[PDB]
Symmetry: C3
Subunit: 183 residues, 3 copies
């Protein structure tokens, strides 16, 4: 049953599952920051069980679907989740991470402090986005990869992230198959 | 102040702030608290003035001035976590994306669009219909031109920005060539 | 005697000394953003006299020690101070400065808007970190130095900072020797 800090600001209609932590001063389900839609809330937010949202996190209502946070996610101070974002399971957003509209973040991705993701981007499984990395609209974000810089570029594979997941070269090759066949 | 402004009850608005009609102030905004200037803090000799039609969506901070009211123009849109320092002047129809940071005395002209997490050095001027890209760092020396796109750390011009007319553009260009 | 805005959210246990300003909507002493510890608070936060925290600043409780803010610091809107950070005296954090876990910031350092400091880094005396600078784990920060960019690189010596401080040549040699040993 959700532990919602009294100072958290939760819009009518937001779905918060059991075993969700919502910390002080979060703003959840307020209108999408889309000038065609604001201040209407056509959709809301859905936060799934085991997710911890520590404080001052903003997660906007969707325009075409519920903004979605998967199981066992960890969102740290001042993170910004725009309208229609879909976050998978076991995702970490560090402090002041910024996800633009319609961004998808896949299973186990780790987004470092103050990284910034262009609207409509896709961060694939077990990616590590470095502090302050700027993911521009056309960048191809490969699974299991580390991205750094302005603009963001691949510097290697996320070995650290792979180990912790405890996942085989089978379930990894499979994720590559999903990435490769995505178009 | 006797108008249809909608202010979320969690917004923290200093006494003396001027809020015009059709304004939206979202949750946990902090408006009109003392300028972050060690020579003045915690005094509030000036305040903040938000003009009609401006939407400030949540978690936005706009500090009171040191030498003038901090000033937000008509029909602006300020998104989550934006920071507006003392003595900033924003013109009409400006967009600040999430976590945009405007240093002290920054001026932002008509129609400027500032992308997520860009940072503008104190005393800079962002000219008419400029596009500042996400995460761009605008340093003190950069000479911003009207209608231009800036990206990067540090910020550099990369282009001109995509229904004003040639007579209106010439009048802007005129203001710029004299300053 | 600490002046604490009614909207500031202060965890049970937080130590706030006299002549401290805590502005609107600060979150101080909430659990460390460490998945091994959260939501436990094994330690807290200690803010020392003279410090001004202007608004919307987050300072998390420690995992291995009290998160510590020294005397006469100035922390501006939206600054993020992670678990186990130790900030010395007369430090300035501009708006949206991010200090990762266990970061140490020494005497008179000045961190510019939205700069980002990797966990376990050390920012030495009277350093200037420029707006948006990304301090990565391998950067050997040196006292009195100016760092800018993504990633951060040394660009010069913080003469403005040294001059303001009024620190003489004797004091600078002691800091320089403290660095040469550690
Ligand atoms: C991206 C990251 C994982 C890389 O760490 P690493 O693999 O140990 O990398 P290194 O520090 O050895 O640096 C490797 C190279 O990448 C660069 N680099 C590393 N992190 C960078 C970053 N965030 N931005 C830009 N460049 C970066 C280094 O400058 C170096 O460049 P070089 O090849 O010219 O020497 C790390 O720097 C990072 O950003 N982690 C996130 C920290 C964070 O968000 N902490 C919050 C915890 S809650
Ligand atoms: C600045 C911006 C408008 C440029 O758009 P664009 O011209 O379509 O840019 P593209 O991604 O097609 O590529 C332009 C070039 O500049 C680079 N670039 C674009 N935006 C950049 C940014 N923010 N930082 C760094 N480099 C950037 C690209 O890498 C590319 O470099 P290259 O051509 O040398 O390979 C856009 O990228 C941007 O930053 N928009 C902000 C997004 C935002 O804030 N959304 C929130 C909505 S509320
Ligand atoms: C870092 C800083 C102190 C350097 O200022 P400065 O010494 O006057 O430097 P200049 O503006 O003369 O620029 C020198 C070089 O550094 C670069 N530079 C300066 N600041 C930079 C920054 N923040 N990021 C990247 N590059 C930067 C310039 O591009 C220039 O490069 P070039 O030699 O290739 O042309 C300043 O730019 C800064 O970032 N200050 C922090 C601002 C702030 O947070 N204010 C809030 C007030 S509370
Ligand atoms: C906390 C506080 O008082 N802040 C105010 C104050 O900032 P400021 O201390 O940076 O002084 P400035 O004279 O602008 O610095 C000039 C240059 O030197 C750089 N600078 C500064 C300090 C330092 O130690 N090192 C350094 O390199 C600096 O980065 C810059 O590039 O003055 C700003 C201003 O009037 O525009 C206000 O917007 C601020 N609210
Ligand atoms: C969410 C959480 O628990 N956070 C805490 C935790 O961080 P952390 O999970 O990043 O582990 P670390 O041992 O610092 O990673 C080492 C390096 O690998 C990088 N790293 C990390 C994960 C990944 O998948 N890939 C990767 O490259 C990583 O970016 C870094 O460059 O531990 C930190 C700490 O002990 O000081 C705390 O400050 C944090 N608040
Ligand atoms: Na609040």
């Amino acid at each position: 049953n959700a532990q919602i800090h009294p100072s958290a600001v939760i819009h009518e209609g937001v779905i918060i599952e059991d075993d969700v932590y919502i910390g002080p001063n979060c703003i959840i389900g307020y209108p999408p920051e889309d000038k065609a839609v604001f201040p209407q809330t056509p959709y809301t937010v859905h936060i799934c069980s085991g997710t911890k949202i520590t404080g001052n996190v903003t997660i906007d209502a969707g325009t075409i679907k519920n903004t979605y946070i998967g199981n066992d996610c960890f969102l740290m101070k001042g993170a910004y989740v725009a309208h229609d974002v879909v976050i998978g399971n076991n995702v970490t957003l560090s402090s002041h991470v910024m996800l633009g509209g319609h961004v998808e973040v896949m299973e186990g991705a780790n987004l470092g402090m103050g990284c910034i993701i262009h609207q409509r981007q896709k961060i694939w499984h077990y990616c590590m986005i470095g502090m302050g990395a700027i993911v521009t609209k056309k960048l191809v974000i490969e699974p299991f990869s580390i991205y750094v810089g302005n603009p963001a570029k691949k510097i290697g594979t996320n070995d650290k992230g792979i180990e912790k997941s405890g996942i085989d070269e089978r379930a990894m090759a499979t994720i590559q198959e999903e990435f490769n066949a995505r178009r």
